[PDB]
């Protein structure tokens with residue numbers, strides 16, 4: 001007879017995820033300022049990471065945190081992002097204190113907990129931008145043309161964050177990045 005796995009195995013996550021950190025430095029290419037922190041694929045390992053790193057609200061302006069499925073780099077150029085887009089959450093200066101941190105954690109939980117159910121395969125990850133003019137959080141998806149998946153993900157995400165329902169958020173395609181209107185709204 002063998003031991004009861006319930007008493008000792010870590011609680012597995014559907015996907016293995018990777019957390020990245022971005023430190024702004026004008027003298028270097030965007031990609032050069034983007035570096036991996038570490039990866040994890042269990043509930044225990046997620047908290048071990050989250051608990052020892054600074055809350056988004058404490059980072060220096062210009063820095064980002066990005067949680068993307070293992071194998072998908074948090075950039076437009078990636079095979080899994082080039083044809084996709086993002087649901088953007090735009091926060092005001094007051095929300096840095098009131099909602100940024102709780103919104104980001106809920107975002108992390110939505111990702112690792114596969115809260116988008118049937119459309120989990122369309123989800124790539126999420127990014128939080130700490131900025132002086134106003135912080136930003138966003139869920140990135142793989143194909144801007146998958147209306148069904150994209151709209152359902154947006155609705156679910158918006159409901160999970162729990163902000164006033166009357167507030168509309170938009171979805172923008174990465175390819176449409178101005179050298180930017182929304183494709184969908186919920």
Ligand SMILES: C[n+]1cn([C@@H]2O[C@H](COP(=O)(O)OP(=O)(O)OP(=O)(O)O)[C@@H](O)[C@H]2O)c2nc(N)[nH]c(=O)c21
Nearest residue numbers: 030031062064074075076077078081127129131136174
């Ligand atoms: C997500 N992303 C951001 N950048 C670079 O980062 C710059 C800033 O893009 P940003 O997404 O970090 O928002 P920010 O608020 O800092 O600035 P703004 O929206 O223009 O006011 C871009 O114009 C790019 O030069 C990126 N550059 C490359 N090559 N690939 C990416 O995926 C990528």
